[PDB]
DNA beta-glucosyltransferase
Amino acid sequence: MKIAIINMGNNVINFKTVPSSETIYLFKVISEMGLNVDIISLKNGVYTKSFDEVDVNDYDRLIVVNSSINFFGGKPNLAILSAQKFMAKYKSKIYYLFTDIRLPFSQSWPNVKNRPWAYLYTEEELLIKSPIKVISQGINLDIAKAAHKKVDNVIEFEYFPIEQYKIHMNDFQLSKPTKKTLDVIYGGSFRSGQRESKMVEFLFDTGLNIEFFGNAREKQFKNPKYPWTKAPVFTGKIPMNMVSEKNSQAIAALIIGDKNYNDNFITLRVWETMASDAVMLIDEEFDTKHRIINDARFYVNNRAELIDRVNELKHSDVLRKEMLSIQHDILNKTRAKKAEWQDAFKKAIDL
DNA sequence: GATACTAGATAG
DNA sequence: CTATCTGAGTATC
Ligand SMILES: O=c1ccn([C@@H]2O[C@H](COP(=O)(O)OP(=O)(O)O)[C@@H](O)[C@H]2O)c(=O)[nH]1
Ligand SMILES: [Mg+2]
């Protein structure tokens, strides 16, 4: 059994970028199941073999991490063109890891074709004809299908909590008690404003010491519909392998998602947050049935509620400690099922 | 005359 | 929101 994993639109090198981190992690946890896997990317590296030096068809399984098809500057993007060309040569089933509802697989030829540099490529190089199997992070396959409604070789869908991988790594450990410097914290990107309203609500104009790490920038929040005066402290991005330690700097860490993450997705940050020394607080709308934890104290409806809950968490260590003890318990139960998870994942890639 | 990393705006 | 169009701003071996 020879397994190849690749990121469709992002180069893979180390933990600098997130897409690069997800691919290496996915690479690791799969190797940890006792499988021989390679990461194919743009060049040879510590963790990667080059697309130009490997016969894609020497792999019994081709796993592909989801990405958009973004020709920045209206210019050719080597990351996307090289992986698709690679996928295009494969003749066996392709397993697409759909972890971001906004990153459904789609052919790039239709796009390249109508570009002024179409003459640089051809349909025979870019068109991916192999049958594709979508492995949705969301249990609601109906939505998964709809996101891939326009692609015909996508003929198989299956739910599987891909993003539980962090808590199932071999070296995984919950964070230790940490000296606090913040009341609330949140890590991530602007995600094209799909959460601008939620970010402003829970992180802007609160009076608390809030920090928003990640690639998001203060100047990106300019929608008059969601005005602000006092913004949280914007610090840049940090390696993915450190996120949970970063959250641990605050009393609490916010959980918010897009419109279609609500009661459908249980994202990675949920585990990264739940794993930290930061009391996890979820936006009510994100999980309206409280499926994550059967304890209303972990849920906030608005700014005022978040502000009340954070203040009551500082006002009392018995409460903060209790809530950190509970969430850690919920996580540790899910970790008890590692084998079960590993099993459904193999069966997910037909093993 | 740097290189790498990172969707945004708009009609239907 | 969804389908389709249009094309660079920011951080740094
Ligand atoms: O500086 C940062 C900020 C975020 N992340 C990762 O990015 C994820 C969040 O991605 P996104 O902003 O797309 O939000 P999501 O859709 O996952 O809720 C986090 O869970 C981390 O894994 C990271 O590695 N470094
Ligand atoms: Mg994700």
